[PDB]
Design an enzyme around this catalytic site. Structure first.
Site, PDB file in Angstrom:
ATOM      1  N   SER A  52       8.265   5.750 -37.529  1.00  0.00           N
ATOM      2  CA  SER A  52       6.955   5.942 -37.128  1.00  0.00           C
ATOM      3  C   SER A  52       5.352   5.997 -38.491  1.00  0.00           C
ATOM      4  CB  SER A  52       6.770   7.681 -36.943  1.00  0.00           C
ATOM      5  OG  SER A  52       7.341   8.327 -35.487  1.00  0.00           O
ATOM      6  N   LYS A  55       2.916   3.985 -36.960  1.00  0.00           N
ATOM      7  CA  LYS A  55       1.896   3.931 -36.719  1.00  0.00           C
ATOM      8  C   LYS A  55      -0.084   4.101 -37.207  1.00  0.00           C
ATOM      9  CE  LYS A  55       3.428   7.645 -33.337  1.00  0.00           C
ATOM     10  NZ  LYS A  55       4.946   8.116 -34.290  1.00  0.00           N
ATOM     11  N   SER A 100       2.739  12.391 -33.693  1.00  0.00           N
ATOM     12  CA  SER A 100       3.641  10.844 -33.480  1.00  0.00           C
ATOM     13  C   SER A 100       4.192  11.062 -32.638  1.00  0.00           C
ATOM     14  CB  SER A 100       4.315  11.235 -34.923  1.00  0.00           C
ATOM     15  OG  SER A 100       4.708   9.824 -35.604  1.00  0.00           O
ATOM     16  N   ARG A 232      12.136  15.899 -46.489  1.00  0.00           N
ATOM     17  CA  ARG A 232      10.606  14.348 -46.840  1.00  0.00           C
ATOM     18  C   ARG A 232       9.557  14.749 -47.380  1.00  0.00           C
ATOM     19  NH1 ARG A 232       9.758  12.336 -41.071  1.00  0.00           N
ATOM     20  NH2 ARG A 232       9.507  14.751 -40.628  1.00  0.00           N
TER      21      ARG A 232
END
Ligand SMILES: *C(=O)[C@@H]([C@@H]1N=C(C(=O)O)[C@H]([C@H]2CCCO2)S1)[C@@H](C)O
Ligand SMILES: [Cl-]
Length: 247
Positions: A52, A55, A100, A232
């Site tokens: 992702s 993007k 997302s 993350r």
């Protein structure tokens, strides 16, 4: 002629991964000092599927080719019900990036098409520039690979409006990348979770705007299940706090 002192390796930050029973790399770049730091120089240069985080370049191309007119244009839900509830509704570019929403960006990819997608990624000097695979999923399970340090490179061009697309396209994507802002910092970033091909990793790439500096960051980490996705951001922020970049 370009000049670069090199990435300094600070293995201190590894405590932030092991104390969460995790494995990964964080890469930081001090824009003012032109200095880079990482906990793991080799993993910093290891290339993975962008997932992702694609993007970001995908949005830039779609906007610059008129596939996406502006940040308010609505991409209506196709009616297929998917595993992520927030995907089963209409979206604009802001919300498609915040949630997302893969099927919106696969449609972008199809309208962009193979030829233009390849040429733009070459112009961006993005990762290995290889789009082999399905036009609408090669960043999920095709040939494209990018490392944490290559993510910083690309992001730095985007920050300075140096990519080979319009300034407006770049301003729009940086707007859509907005993630957090307060009286102390602004974070523009994009998450990612690569699951289709091993190894399963999570990404967080972007940058921290301060009053008189910008810290770019790119991290990825082994992510065997989605239960650890919050790490993350948490691990990255622990590193940002340790280095006194955010309070
Ligand atoms: C992007 O890499 C994936 C989408 N991004 C996330 C993310 O957290 O960054 C979503 C997570 C949330 C639940 C499982 O996936 S999906 C895309 C490739 O699926
Ligand atoms: Cl903004």
């Amino acid at each position: 002629n370009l000049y670069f002192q090199g990435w300094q390796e600070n293995k201190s930050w590894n405590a932030h991964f092991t104390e969460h029973k995790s494995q990964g790399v964080v890469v930081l770049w001090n824009e003012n000092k032109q200095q880079g730091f990482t906990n793991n120089l080799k993993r910093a240069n290891q290339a993975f599927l962008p997932a992702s985080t694609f993007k970001i370049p995908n949005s830039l191309i779609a906007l610059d080719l008129g596939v996406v007119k502006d940040e308010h244009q609505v991409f209506k839900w196709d009616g297929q019900t998917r595993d992520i509830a927030t995907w089963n509704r209409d979206h604009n570019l802001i919300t498609a990036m915040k949630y997302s929403v893969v099927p919106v960006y696969q449609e972008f990819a199809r309208q962009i098409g193979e030829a233009r997608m390849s040429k733009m990624l070459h112009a961006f000097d993005y990762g290995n520039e290889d789009i082999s695979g399905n036009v609408d999923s090669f960043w999920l399970d095709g040939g494209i690979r990018i490392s944490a340090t290559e993510q910083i490179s690309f992001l730095r061009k985007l920050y300075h409006n140096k990519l080979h697309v319009s300034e407006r396209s770049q301003r729009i994507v940086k707007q859509a990348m907005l993630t957090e802002a307060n009286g102390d910092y602004i974070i523009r970033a994009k998450t990612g979770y690569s699951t289709r091909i091993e190894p399963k990793i999570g990404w967080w790439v972007g940058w921290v705007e301060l009053d008189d500096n910008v810290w770019f960051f790119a991290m990825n980490m082994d992510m065997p299940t989605s239960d650890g996705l919050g790490l993350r951001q948490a691990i990255t922020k622990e590193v940002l706090k340790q280095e006194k970049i955010i309070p």
